[PDB]
Ligand SMILES: O=C1N[C@H](c2c(CNCCCCCCNCc3[nH]c4ccccc4c3[C@H]3NC(=O)c4ccc(O)cc43)[nH]c3ccccc23)c2cc(O)ccc21
Ligand SMILES: Nc1nc2c(ncn2[C@@H]2O[C@H](COP(=O)(O)OP(=O)(O)CP(=O)(O)O)[C@@H](O)[C@H]2O)c(=O)[nH]1
Ligand SMILES: Nc1nc2c(ncn2[C@@H]2O[C@H](COP(=O)(O)OP(=O)(O)CP(=O)(O)O)[C@@H](O)[C@H]2O)c(=O)[nH]1
């Protein structure tokens with residue numbers, strides 16, 4: 001069985017854990033419990049192929065910024081998550097992408113730009129701006145909601161297709 | 168900060184995942200999703216000491232019986248779980264105990280016997296029988312419910328106290 005090593009990255013509070021928990025447990029976590037580092041091994045069927053997703057739910061807190069190098073080295077694909085109502089989280093994407101590109105020593109790293117909390121009316125980042133940034137990176141962009149499940153399966157499955165399309 | 172590697176072991180369906188998820192997320196999972204291998208890191212305060220719990224939620228399914236050797240070598244303490252309404256799960260306990268003791272080459276391995284699903288009225292395993300088995304092992308015995316949260320914090324904290332004694 002083919003294994004896919006996925007890493008969920010982004011600023012503290014964007015919904016990395018809620019997106020991961022929504023995908024696996026089909027429920028929305030309203031509580032904010034800062035992550036140190038959690039991992040999940042889940043068997044899924046993507047495009048008729050049964051595969052194992054090894055998902056790493058990382059810390060957004062800058063206090064764990066030294067843990068990054070090792071998980072970026074072993075990670076095969078990166079879900080770069082920002083919140084559509086948090087401008088700093090969108091700006092932080094560039095830093096996460098540059099660090100991934102540095103560690104991996106490649107400009108062609110499987111990545112998906114994720115604009116989470118798309119259920120919220122308090123938007124600060126235009127869809128077109130996020131789309132343009134994803135285009136400058138040459139990566140897909142998906143708007144998601146860990147609450148409604150909108151784009152959640154699509155974000156994770158697109159990332160697997162990116163790793164597969166790269167291999 | 169002191170780290171404690173905790174391994175949750177036991178028969179398929181005893182509530183290893185529900186106990187782990189209840190401890191960390193303060194949420195009861197009603198669904199039965201067989202585990203491959205999940206890991207969680209949680210910062211807690213035990214007896215005035217701030218520590219990090221590195222919890223491995225293992226597969227109860229006999230199909231992943233080869234994965235055991237590695238995590239039994241690195242695991243510092245083991246939560247051995249059975250369900251009070253499942254006689255076979257209680258009988259399987261001695262097999263987990265005997266494998267841990269074999270891999271560690273010691274009869275003094277930090278362990279806690281856990282009697283889960285104590286919220287259920289359909290009991291088939293007597294508390295006295297489980298207490299007597301824990302006594303033959305020289306380990307603590309705690310009855311728990313991943314649904315009500317009864318004994319959950321006590322089971323994990325007792326295990327940490329067991330590792331601290333051994334160290
Ligand atoms: O020595 C062991 N440590 C593991 C363990 C953990 C940490 N859990 C995770 C597991 C790790 C495996 C790898 C693929 N599963 C974890 C996983 N999924 C990923 C997805 C993307 C990128 C990296 C990873 C990783 C990690 N693998 C790396 O190389 C790596 C680099 C930097 C990271 O920060 C994270 C990872 N907690 C425990 C508590 C008690 C007992 C054992 C443990 C473990 C498990 C096991 O069955 C047998 C032995 C061990
Ligand atoms: N409305 C809405 N709220 C969300 C969404 N995703 C996450 N949240 C909320 O945002 C808060 C933070 O979510 P969380 O999943 O813990 O974010 P995180 O990026 O993992 C935080 P850390 O980096 O510290 O681990 C929570 O209160 C959660 O309910 C979403 O898609 N929509
Ligand atoms: N009433 C009650 N039900 C429980 C309790 N703990 C677990 N369950 C239920 O038992 C079922 C299986 O629980 P689960 O946590 O997946 O057990 P597991 O030992 O992890 C199964 P696997 O070994 O395959 O990973 C679920 O439906 C769950 O809700 C409990 O304390 N009380």
Ligand SMILES: [Mg+2]
Pocket residue numbers: 016017018033034035057058060
């Ligand atoms: Mg988180």
Ligand SMILES: [Mg+2]
Pocket residue numbers: 183184185200201202224225226227
């Ligand atoms: Mg389980």
